[PDB]
Design goal:
Chain lengths: 104, 106, 102, 104, 104, 104, 106, 102, 104, 104, 106, 104, 102, 104, 106, 102
């Protein structure tokens, strides 16, 4: 009943993208969600194209999707290994359904 | 795919921000309002302006202003995509919004 | 097939979708009512701001208001009796009452 | 009138301190506060000892306090130019009372 | 110095509340005051709970007062950020004393 | 001695046109006059082209005038059923003479 | 009919806002002042400027300024109708004011 | 036909129509006097600011001022006696005194 | 901080009152003061009852004072919005003390 | 030893030219000088082309000078009936020498 | 005669506002300083700028700036007469100052 | 709030007084202070009696003090418009306390 | 013909005509000295800021300074004795001492 | 072990170039260094092309360098009579090494 | 020789002001950073901007902006020498920096 | 030839040359290490922020840290023993240890 979630971000300067002075609202929303889930022992793993290029090749699902749609298709979110979202971050509603947690 | 494009829509003067007030009830207005709300839910903001409510923006925005000089106000609504005129007289089709946005609408 | 009738709170326009802030529940039910309308199915709705008298003349709505106040709105009648209060019917409900797949 | 709030962080690798995989919850809390304030037009400026060492010297109130207690006193928060908090970030309650903004 | 006056209306269908056939005389009176003030360069800003729900939450002074007394307390008028009137609109006399403008 | 007054406005977003933030001085003047007369049991009926198109057709005097002069000729004021004013609202002086009241 | 048009009149430099001071006593000035007052009574405002009193407006207003570059100040009075030059050297006739305004003057 | 003569308060110019604020009564009487002038009919007016001596030498105006002060102005004489004080003659009056239809 | 000085003259034929052959020495004295101040960037605004009757009504402090004492009280001088002088113009000494400018 | 001084100004809106809000420094200087001399029973007569055109014709000295140089040559100052200055106002130094007074 | 014309002079960068400091001692600088002072005494102000002291005015003044783009700074001093370039490289002759000013200099 | 500091130097040959071969150490010290302040956006304006004689007369506080003590009292330093120091330049410590800037 | 020599106060440049404020007396005497120079007549001037030693070595100037201080400057010597103190010679004076018509 | 230093500046308005309101940071740095060394009886002589043109000709080293590189090559610093720096002022580090003093 | 020229460099968007962070590690970035630091030591300041950090400067600077309109952002880095485009796509060679600066680099 | 190994303090990037303020000592040692690398000579460096475990497993570095704390960093090992603490090796030192002329 609990689906596993893996996020492949675009190339960013830090794992959360929340480094600099201008805060992207969507990056903050998803980082807060991930940190909430983490507090509860639910791990959403994320990758950064700048830090781990190889996983964007070695994951065949992500690789084939990037071949068709390009790096502009990032972020890609996998749910149980299936592409579930592309170009925007999953909605908190999606994250609650997938994890069975009730996130604000 | 392409990077998502910024979309900003300049409505005619209407009695409410969505045009869904009153009697005429143009289904286009409902189509585009539904699209805008679906995007909002996904964290994508399509900024709208209403001439009746924010007249100063139709001036301050140089692109919108000039187009209006050279076509009149019967050219509203104007939709800018990454700052440039993309559609006028009519609201962007769902196909276009879907293309500019990367979101599979409907 | 069942008759559905909706008594809204007082709103500034018939769908409540006037202002800058769109209530997602209002747009949901408006979209449903428009789809029904296109199937030839008419879900009558009332706005307390414009049709105050119907909230008095419908006895079932009137008695419910005496007991619970405007807080109870919207009220949805289904074949003449209260089926939903305070929130709009779910799309699942509408489909079941109309037999249309929304 | 509006109390001016200015925060002097310890040395960090980015302006919010949210630069790695482990999110320090205090750094996240204060970043979210500053973002919510910024949405209201209220600007809380902050400095990072790593990139602006000079301002920690030229600000007399900060410099005197660090001469006394050392860099371990950071973060220091000034409210209208006076030291209001050191060692820890201001609480959300404090930030709320100083700005007149509900930060729940 | 000039007292800042800011009015938080109940939910209404338009910014002045003068949106139908029956003119509420209090709404008319306060609209005329605000217009006369605006002619003198004095800006009384007002909010409508219907279109700006968020500001009734983010303004701490208004939010605390509504948490306590509920939406029936509206209109609330702030003078220099403090609650000066609730339940009813400020009288013309009050508005006149706060602004130094004769509003007969 | 008291003439009956009926005003046919242009298409407006509300019966008084006083809905939004910018107050047209002439709309406010005429709305205040109408409300004063109303307080005294003198009824000036007004129409809005947006809300009652049909009356702009069914009143032959207004219909024939609109055929010649167009909607740009609105507002049209009838006094005892005769066109008396076009394009501007009647002067308060006119309103006092027609109603026998002494309006400010 | 047409919508009423905005009228703004830029006088020469005169010793008073209406020019009705002193000895010369040009009847045109009286004609236009009477027209302006009749409009005022009906809630229609014709804004006037006097060069002697508000010099900065003859600069800040780009249209007025340029015309003055290219004709001189002997081109005053200038009348703008909806922002554009409509008359110069002389005051608008009553026929024109009447046409721009929808009011039956005289 | 009757002689009309008007003694204004002190004003900044002969018609009082100088400034930004036009007094509608002043423009009314100025327009009347100009129409008369064109019929060949001269209504003499005085301005206290420029012709103080005439307010002394006309005995009727002088005595009225001693009793009522500058408050009494404008004074209109009609065939040499005070006909109007404090406001300008109505257009109806002017027409009657001149026999011209204004 | 700078005291704001605002002068409300009687009705006059021009803004300085220096409009004829006989120079009133008080009008000349105060015009020269205002000119010297203007050279220093200090703006003393003045009003003429003849051309701005409305401001004598809308300014509550001036209006109340004239309701009480009549137009013979003019000139009235406000310093920071309060009545500081009436009947006569402020002395050069007063103007000098209020502005910090030597007006010999 | 005391020379008689007569000034013929350009067309101006009042005898001193000091009527409006913007004060020409030279007009103020010469008006103050004239008023000082007047206080001492020394009369400097001045003319305004707007108020007395005829004297600009009937004075042959001024007439012949205007024929050659035009109205742009005004102001013209006569000293004992001789043209003494043209286009600018006499210097206070000139005025002191001509009158035998020691003006500031 | 003509109305007096406004004269504004933009000096090169000099160690003092008049250039009368030091050793070289160009008699032109003394000529023009004497003229300027004679005018001052008669209530006529010739505004001077020194590039070294007020650099921002050589920018803010659009006319001066453009001329400098298209000729270099070896074009200083520039003299404006009623706002327009009248002389460059050299200071206006006394004949010109006398003509622009209506004053009989020397 | 920021104390405004304004310095009135004696007559000197250049604005800093550093115009010859012998550097007066007090002039150098205060120039360096003013430069460091200017780097922080804090403007200490200064005047030179030689080039701005007029401001020493029009500033009433300075003028009164010089009338009393003569030019030998210069430099005079005003802090918020009041005399704070005369005869000598303010010490670096004073400048530091008035501005909140560490000037070591 | 008489030798003229001028000892200025300390000034920022040899004529004192450096700054934004021109002292009319300084320009007057500078113009005179330049006209003389052109007639081949040299009026030597000293600036206390640059030539302090000459104010000591000229005994007449030195003694005058001991008694009256820098307040006495400018001092003008004419054939070696003090002719003017505290103000510059008038143009009339210069003409008389040089025999040139200035 | 102590090298003699002579600086030939560009044409400047005063020996230090520190005369005017805008302070060139490099001119201030080198002037402070020179003044420090002077306090210690170490004399760095400097020339100004405006004040001593002749020394720029009579020093053959400077003369030959200017023939090749032009006045734009100034400032030229000699150390024991050898060109050591051109176009910029010597670094404080250079000055310390050359003089054997430890300058800040 | 020539007067030293002002040099201002507009970097691409990078994760740090020098680009010396991470993995790729373009030796050009190290070359230019070393040059910039050698100049700094001699009191010569080469101002750098990073698009990621100071986006507003890439707008406010009209020259940089226009070039970007007409070439794209793949034209970064742009180097201005006395305000004008001198190099794009690549960082100035040490020879150029040395020439613009009068400093013998390396 | 001697093995050189450098244990940096925690830094934000491998050379510490990330930010707006360049530490001249860091650029000096980075330039040296790059020149060595080009001679085929590898001076391994560690960053405490990314490789914490190596500061524990190297016993010599570990014991030094227990005694002196992170204050001791950077530590330079030369043939396995501490040669420099708290500052980076001088270029002279690097040349001597590598035998390369830097
Ligand atoms: Ca601590
Ligand atoms: Ca209540
Ligand atoms: Ca009185
Ligand atoms: Ca002393």
């Amino acid at each position: 009943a609990m689906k596993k979630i893996e996020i492949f971000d675009p190339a960013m300067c830090c794992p959360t993208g929340l480094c600099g002075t201008n805060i992207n609202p969507e990056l903050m929303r998803i980082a807060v969600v991930i940190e909430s889930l983490k507090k509860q022992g639910i791990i959403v793993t994320r990758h950064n194209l700048r830090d781990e290029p190889q996983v964007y090749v070695s994951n065949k699902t992500v690789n084939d999707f990037l071949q068709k749609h390009g790096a502009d298709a990032l972020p890609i979110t996998l749910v149980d290994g299936e592409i579930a979202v592309s170009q925007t971050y999953p909605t908190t509603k999606q994250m609650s359904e997938w994890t069975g947690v009730n996130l604000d």
